[PDB]
Amino acid sequence: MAMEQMTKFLKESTYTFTGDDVDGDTVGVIPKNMMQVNSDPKSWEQGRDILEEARKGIIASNPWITNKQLTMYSQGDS
């Protein structure tokens, strides 16, 4: 039961990011709590779009990277 319960908790509260072809199609994991833009938690969805427009926006400005591919990480409040 512990596995299913921690899995459900992470599934309801987190969100994996993904980009172009990357082995395992996962680039970072941020909680759906640190991505809101309003007081209601559904607003996380809106806060998601900006990031997918920001990450791409960085790739379109910093192409010299190893792959045209960044990472993602949320420590504390950032």
């Binding site: 909680p31 709590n33 007081s39 938690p41 559904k42």
Partner: protein, 47 residues
């Protein structure tokens, strides 16, 4: 002869430094959605 020892005592003070208090434990994202949209997360994705 006068006693060269006074009842006056030495004083030490506490290292009392106050920084910035922490925010309380914000509600879990499941309960957040509950008392804001009246229905749990499972009942919202079934639509």
């Amino acid at each position: 002869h006068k006693q060269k020892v006074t009842q006056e005592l030495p004083e030490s003070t506490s290292f009392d430094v106050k920084g910035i208090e922490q925010e309380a434990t914000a509600k879990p994202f499941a309960k957040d959605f509950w008392e804001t949209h009246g229905e749990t997360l499972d009942e919202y994705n079934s639509r």
